[PDB]
Structures are given as structure tokens and as C-alpha cells.
């Protein structure tokens, strides 16, 4: 009746261009974590070395900020998601991967999501995403 209501997952705005199978068979070297802010902030300074984040943002949704973090390596979203997941004990944790870097930090920088901070000049804009019909 009043509880600001939890995010169980990510909104259908950056459900456009995500990839949701948490046991697929895909090695994604993107992904954006959706957690609490102070979450956000834990990841950022930690993942910043675990994985060289290609780029790293936090922005700003409804109630928490989605971390948004690229990596160089490959590696499964069963593999990366057991790093979200080892930061779950002091609030929910909703980290899933991302098929396109580019277009989903593109929806998440423009609104109704805002930019908080990030490791680039200019957000992703890494090269090394893929072409696609756009």
C-alpha cells in the first residue's frame, strides 16, 4: 500500500534488446546489472578489475540504478551472473546480460532513463560492439 514496489526484473523499455536466458549456451561479453544503487557502486569499483569493464555506467531507472558493465573476455551469463549474485546479501539483485551493448546503454543514457556516472567520455562508444540494421 505505500512500500515503494521492487523491481522483480528489468522494465519492458530495455526489454527491447536483452538476452533474459540466464542458462543459455551463449558466451556474452556485455551485461547490465539492475540492483539497488549502493549495489551498483560495490560492482563497479569491483568488476572494474575482475572483468576490465570495456566501460562501466550507473544510471538512474525508477527506484535503483542499473549498473551497466562491458567485458573483454568471453564468459557465460551463468558465469558473470554468479558475480552479481555473490553481492545479494544486503538487498535484491537482478543482473542479467545484453545482446546489444550500444542500442540498450542507448536507451538507458537517453529517458526516461538518466546517466549517474561512467568510467567513458562519451558512455559505451567502445570499439568493439557489432553493426547491425539500424
Keep these: 500500500g505505500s ?3 521492487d523491481p522483480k526484473d ?5 526489454l527491447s ?3 533474459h536466458a540466464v542458462f543459455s549456451n551463449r558466451t556474452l561479453a556485455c551485461f547490465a546489472i539492475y540492483t539497488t544503487k549502493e549495489k551498483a557502486a560495490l560492482l563497479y569499483k569491483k568488476i572494474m578489475e575482475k572483468y576490465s569493464v570495456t566501460f562501466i555506467s550507473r ?29 545479494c546479501t544486503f538487498s535484491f539483485l537482478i543482473c ?8 540498450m546503454y542507448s536507451a538507458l543514457t537517453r529517458d526516461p532513463f538518466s546517466v ?19
Excluded: C, M
Aim: glycine share 4%; aromatic share 12%; proline share 6%.
Design 96 to 103: 542479467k546480460g545484453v545482446n546489444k551493448e550500444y542500442l
Design 17 to 19: 534488446f536483452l538476452s
Design 3 to 5: 512500500k515503494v514496489e
Design 116 to 134: 549517474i556516472e561512467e568510467s567513458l567520455p562519451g558512455g559505451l562508444k567502445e570499439h568493439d560492439f557489432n553493426p547491425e540494421s539500424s
Design 10 to 14: 528489468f522494465p519492458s523499455e530495455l
Design 59 to 87: 544510471h538512474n531507472s525508477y527506484n535503483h540504478n542499473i549498473l551497466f558493465f562491458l567485458t573483454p573476455h568471453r564468459h557465460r551469463v551463468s558465469a558473470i551472473n554468479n558475480y552479481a549474485q555473490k553481492l
